[PDB]
Design a binder for this molecule. Sequence first.
Ligand code: HEC
Length: 292
Amino acid sequence: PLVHVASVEKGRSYEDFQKVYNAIALKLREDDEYDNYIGYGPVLVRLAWHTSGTWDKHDNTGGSYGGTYRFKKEFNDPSNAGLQNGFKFLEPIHKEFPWISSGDLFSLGGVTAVQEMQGPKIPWRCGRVDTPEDTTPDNGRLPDADKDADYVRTFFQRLNMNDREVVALMGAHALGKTHLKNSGYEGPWGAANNVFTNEFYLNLLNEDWKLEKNDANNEQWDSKSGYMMLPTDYSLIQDPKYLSIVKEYANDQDKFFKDFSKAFEKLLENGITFPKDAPSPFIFKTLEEQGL
Ligand code: HEC
């Protein structure tokens, strides 16, 4: 197993990363029209997860550390279709702050998006270091959506996530939507899809779902409110262990926030060794908290 030791960008401290956070946050506010006024929040959360979610605990390949999505093999992974929009949004940020590593920027984009969308605070640590093109993981390590709960459970063991962490992370599917041209699935999961809430679990339990085929000839679950669930989303209410946890998060907003925060930080930190004297995780203030 490879070791990736966090190395703080030289001379940087919390203030420097709060400025990067702020630039991302201000651009999220400015470029509000994207994706029919959903805004870039959801795609940036997805970019942070896909750049992290290639990790393999068994050999420490993939993961957020190396920033490898900047290389064409990963950029062009069919599982990443659509994420180029988030990369494009981050380009002017990286140009302004060229000292931040790519993995630090992709992960911080996700943290900033969750918090600016009124999600929980996500502690975040710096020090990912860009690694060379030959460290890019091959395609095929991100999950399929047409699968059942057994597939989801097994898939996430590779990311060292347990049932609770899986169910909490999937609550990010409140955000954004599926786009047929990107993934073969179409529609949002709920109404509040650029504000981070526990709506995903409420809709799983509360909506009347019908198994339909979309225009790409794939099955998805649809509600008459115009929401959808992927087969892997719906698996969370088919499996009795996941269903218990879905009910818990549908009934406790604060517990979902706390558990999501922990699991998302862990996702973004998998694979990284933080030296004992590394800085503590940073908790960035939102623009609203700063009066900006
Ligand atoms: C914590 C983050 C998170 C996790 C974990 C996650 N997703 Fe997503 N996913 C998102 C976000 C956010 C979006 C919305 C992106 C957008 O609106 O551009 C999304 C969108 C998608 C889409 C639609 C992409 C498109 O633009 O068409 C698919 C398909 C998808 N997820 C599949 C899955 C599957 C399969 C899993 C696991 C079994 C999963 N996701 C786990 C955050 C996540």
